[PDB]
Amino acid sequence: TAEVMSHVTAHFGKTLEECREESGLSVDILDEFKHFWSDDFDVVHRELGCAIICMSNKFSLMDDDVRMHHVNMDEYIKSFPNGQVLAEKMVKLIHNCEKQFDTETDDCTRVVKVAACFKEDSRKEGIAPEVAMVEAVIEKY
Template structure:
């Protein structure tokens, strides 16, 4: 399911996806204890992929801006899926949505 995240047809709406994203992010230490992004770890993680050095700051900025929009949602899974949907839209607007090679690299690590 994660490899379809960036396709136009894939709707980022289900709470369960938010829970899965939290689980996967915790595996890579990308979240703080309050399930908000850990900025330093996220920067380092993004930098580890092709073109990651160039994308890291912008991706973390977009994620953080989306987190701020949905900060009042108390359910971690619900909030995370809203943040993910926001990030998907904003990353596509900025032209930095990952290409299939990066998605495949992430899937290999997971």
């Protein structure tokens, strides 16, 4: 659900700043990872794709070929409250996007294209949070 995705996003986003330099991702492109979900944030920059690799690697969410590791992704998602309701759908949805971009061999570019597809399909399927839901989780600390 969108509520569960808010919790996943809020945690996943904590590795933005440590990944910023190696990805070449300007603050001007993305200042806080929660804005990934803004209606009018365009998910396009190769640097954001590099950042997403870097952030995923932190939680072993990538397989040897820089695609989603399905098992580790499922385990990550179920580590959040009610995570089991989202885990099957989210893997299926991401993997479907990956197949559409399998002919992009540049890893950063492939991953940003996959991220954009995942955002769009997440809205269609009802698992996209609003920024305010993401902020509400972050704000409990």
